[PDB]
Design an enzyme around this catalytic site. Structure first.
Site, PDB file in Angstrom:
ATOM      1  N   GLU B  14       0.790  -1.224   0.000  1.00 31.07           N
ATOM      2  CA  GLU B  14       0.000   0.000   0.000  1.00 31.07           C
ATOM      3  C   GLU B  14       0.831   1.288   0.000  1.00 31.07           C
ATOM      4  OE1 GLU B  14      -3.243  -2.414  -0.341  1.00 31.07           O
ATOM      5  OE2 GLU B  14      -3.401  -0.224  -0.331  1.00 31.07           O
ATOM      6  N   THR B  19       0.869   2.018  -8.236  1.00 34.68           N
ATOM      7  CA  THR B  19       0.483   3.315  -8.769  1.00 34.68           C
ATOM      8  C   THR B  19       1.597   3.947  -9.596  1.00 34.68           C
ATOM      9  OG1 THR B  19      -1.031   3.718  -6.915  1.00 34.68           O
ATOM     10  CG2 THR B  19      -0.337   5.650  -8.192  1.00 34.68           C
ATOM     11  N   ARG B 149      -7.598  -0.917  -7.990  1.00 32.72           N
ATOM     12  CA  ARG B 149      -6.714  -1.819  -7.275  1.00 32.72           C
ATOM     13  C   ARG B 149      -7.021  -3.178  -7.882  1.00 32.72           C
ATOM     14  NH1 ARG B 149      -5.294  -0.228  -2.251  1.00 32.72           N
ATOM     15  NH2 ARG B 149      -5.742  -2.280  -1.324  1.00 32.72           N
ATOM     16  N   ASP B 171       8.323  -4.589  -9.966  1.00 26.93           N
ATOM     17  CA  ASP B 171       7.622  -4.498  -8.687  1.00 26.93           C
ATOM     18  C   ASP B 171       7.199  -5.899  -8.249  1.00 26.93           C
ATOM     19  OD1 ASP B 171       6.066  -3.906  -6.433  1.00 26.93           O
ATOM     20  OD2 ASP B 171       4.304  -3.356  -7.614  1.00 26.93           O
ATOM     21  N   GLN B 175       3.497 -10.516  -3.748  1.00 23.50           N
ATOM     22  CA  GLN B 175       3.826 -11.909  -4.012  1.00 23.50           C
ATOM     23  C   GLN B 175       5.054 -12.342  -3.216  1.00 23.50           C
ATOM     24  OE1 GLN B 175       3.150 -14.802  -4.292  1.00 23.50           O
ATOM     25  NE2 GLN B 175       2.555 -15.049  -6.446  1.00 23.50           N
TER      26      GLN B 175
HETATM   27  N1  LIG Z   1      -4.284   9.989  -1.726  1.00 28.02           N
HETATM   28  C1  LIG Z   1      -3.296   9.203  -2.172  1.00 28.02           C
HETATM   29  N2  LIG Z   1      -3.524   7.893  -2.396  1.00 28.02           N
HETATM   30  C2  LIG Z   1      -2.408   7.228  -2.859  1.00 28.02           C
HETATM   31  C3  LIG Z   1      -1.139   7.733  -3.109  1.00 28.02           C
HETATM   32  N3  LIG Z   1      -0.282   6.740  -3.575  1.00 28.02           N
HETATM   33  C4  LIG Z   1      -1.045   5.701  -3.579  1.00 28.02           C
HETATM   34  N4  LIG Z   1      -2.335   5.904  -3.160  1.00 28.02           N
HETATM   35  C5  LIG Z   1      -3.445   4.967  -3.017  1.00 28.02           C
HETATM   36  O1  LIG Z   1      -3.013   4.091  -1.984  1.00 28.02           O
HETATM   37  C6  LIG Z   1      -3.165   2.720  -2.317  1.00 28.02           C
HETATM   38  C7  LIG Z   1      -1.689   2.226  -2.289  1.00 28.02           C
HETATM   39  O2  LIG Z   1      -1.420   0.945  -2.877  1.00 28.02           O
HETATM   40  P1  LIG Z   1      -0.833   0.822  -4.394  1.00 28.02           P
HETATM   41  O3  LIG Z   1      -0.726   2.113  -5.007  1.00 28.02           O
HETATM   42  O4  LIG Z   1      -1.629  -0.241  -5.063  1.00 28.02           O
HETATM   43  O5  LIG Z   1       0.658   0.283  -4.191  1.00 28.02           O
HETATM   44  P2  LIG Z   1       1.331  -0.960  -3.418  1.00 28.02           P
HETATM   45  O6  LIG Z   1       0.322  -1.714  -2.675  1.00 28.02           O
HETATM   46  O7  LIG Z   1       2.404  -0.314  -2.511  1.00 28.02           O
HETATM   47  O8  LIG Z   1       2.023  -1.679  -4.474  1.00 28.02           O
HETATM   48  C8  LIG Z   1      -3.871   2.744  -3.665  1.00 28.02           C
HETATM   49  O9  LIG Z   1      -5.260   2.499  -3.458  1.00 28.02           O
HETATM   50  C9  LIG Z   1      -3.681   4.147  -4.253  1.00 28.02           C
HETATM   51  O10 LIG Z   1      -4.760   4.690  -5.035  1.00 28.02           O
HETATM   52  C10 LIG Z   1      -0.895   9.132  -2.861  1.00 28.02           C
HETATM   53  O11 LIG Z   1       0.152   9.750  -3.011  1.00 28.02           O
HETATM   54  N5  LIG Z   1      -2.050   9.796  -2.388  1.00 28.02           N
HETATM   55 MG   LIG Z   2       0.769  -4.419  -2.824  1.00 26.66          MG
END
Ligand SMILES: Nc1nc2c(ncn2[C@@H]2O[C@H](COP(=O)(O)OP(=O)(O)O)[C@@H](O)[C@H]2O)c(=O)[nH]1
Ligand SMILES: [Mg+2]
EC number: 3.6.5.-
Lengths: 36, 320
Positions: B14, B19, B149, B171, B175
């Site tokens: 997360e 992203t 997501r 990335d 996993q």
């Molecule tokens: N508001 C906001 N949401 C973010 C930001 N970066 C990521 N997110 C949200 O936070 C969640 C982060 O998980 P993700 O982006 O899937 O990356 P991962 O799980 O680290 O690989 C997602 O639902 C994104 O839409 C950010 O800078 N601001």
């Molecule tokens: Mg993840």
């Protein structure tokens, strides 16, 4: 031991919100107990 | 010659890794066509429903009642309607059920205590736009797609050329991988982009964790940047979700994460304090340099600007 780092990576990179990522599944639809 | 630039995204779940990958596609690739966007309507609705359900489940665990007793039947209905809804479409019935729950003061109270459980950061984004998203003629925008997501099956990768460089962004995220797989991921890495969710600073400790999420992230960043194997690798640090951090710092003191913090609760001093906590873990400030950037991974403009600056670093770091 790199094996220690690997452990740390799997532990850290796997944490986070659960059941909130794919298409809807019968598992995410179970009814919370307090609503039964 | 167009050398290969192997980029490895690392960081807690997360933190924004997925992203960043999608931003590269939007910025240095074709991005998403309207036809591709329509394809995400189903995941948009799935994510929207998973979000409201997550909050509902927390209300039961945290024992938070609905502002209106009637919402209880809506919650149950939420589960039945969703379970019978066809992937890709949202009935006026389900839309109403969700809008009423999201509107409930009890539900909002639980939403505002999200630090106590684990709620994805796309929840509010979608839930607030139920007017636009619910309509049967809904076409997910590029930003909507960015916020989706999806199922992370194995290592994810993306290709793209920028400034005559062949970027290969990896990335592993989520996993669980074996020592062998990781070694293979590391070998050849030209730069590591370590993502951190700044807004994770106020998260309540889980039953099985010795340290808060931020310190676990620090522990990993410590192993990575001080590991001799990356001496020549560019260590880029993305202090992400600066937008959420800024909104939170107002109500939740940083002292929740760092009991020793004696600074003010302004975005500026709190963020700076966090930048120092991570950067100070570097045991060779003379040798290695950490390239820190405060980001908002969901902001294409910001990511573009930042990835532009990361590229300049990769270039000159190539002792040329
Ligand atoms: N508001 C906001 N949401 C973010 C930001 N970066 C990521 N997110 C949200 O936070 C969640 C982060 O998980 P993700 O982006 O899937 O990356 P991962 O799980 O680290 O690989 C997602 O639902 C994104 O839409 C950010 O800078 N601001
Ligand atoms: Mg993840």
């Amino acid at each position: 031991d790199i094996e220690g780092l690997v452990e740390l990576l799997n532990r850290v990179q796997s944490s986070g919100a659960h059941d909130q990522r794919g298409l809807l599944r019968k598992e995410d639809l179970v009814l919370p107990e307090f609503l039964q | 010659g167009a050398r290969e630039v192997k980029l490895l995204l690392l960081g807690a779940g997360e933190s924004g890794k997925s992203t960043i990958v999608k931003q590269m596609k939007i910025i240095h690739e074709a991005g998403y066509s309207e036809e591709e966007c329509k394809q995400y309507k189903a995941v948009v609705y799935s994510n929207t429903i998973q979000s409201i359900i997550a909050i509902i489940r927390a209300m039961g665990r945290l024992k938070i009642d609905f502002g209106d007793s009637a919402r209880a039947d809506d919650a149950r209905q939420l589960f039945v309607l969703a379970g019978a809804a066809e992937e890709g479409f949202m009935t006026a019935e389900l839309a109403g059920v969700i809008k009423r729950l999201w509107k409930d003061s009890g539900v909002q109270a639980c939403f505002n205590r999200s630090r106590e459980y684990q709620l994805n950061d796309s929840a509010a984004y979608y839930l607030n736009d139920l007017d636009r998203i619910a309509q049967p003629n809904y076409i997910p925008t590029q930003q909507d797609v960015l916020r989706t997501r999806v199922k992370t099956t194995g290592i994810v990768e993306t290709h793209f050329t920028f400034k005559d460089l062949h970027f290969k962004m990896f990335d592993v995220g989520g996993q669980r991988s074996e020592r062998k797989k990781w070694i293979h991921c590391f070998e050849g890495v030209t730069a590591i982009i370590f993502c951190v969710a700044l807004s994770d600073y106020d998260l309540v400790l889980a039953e099985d964790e010795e340290m808060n999420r931020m310190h676990e992230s620090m522990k990993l960043f410590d192993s990575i940047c001080n590991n001799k194997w990356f001496t020549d690798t560019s260590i880029i640090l993305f202090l992400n979700k600066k937008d959420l951090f800024e909104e939170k710092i107002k109500k939740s003191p940083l002292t929740i994460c760092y009991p020793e913090y004696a600074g003010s609760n302004t975005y500026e001093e709190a963020a700076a304090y966090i930048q120092c906590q991570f950067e100070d873990l570097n045991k060779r400030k003379d040798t290695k340099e950490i390239y820190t950037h405060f980001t908002c991974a969901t902001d294409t403009k910001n990511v573009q600007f930042v990835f532009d600056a990361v590229t300049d670093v990769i270039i000159k770091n190539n002792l040329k």
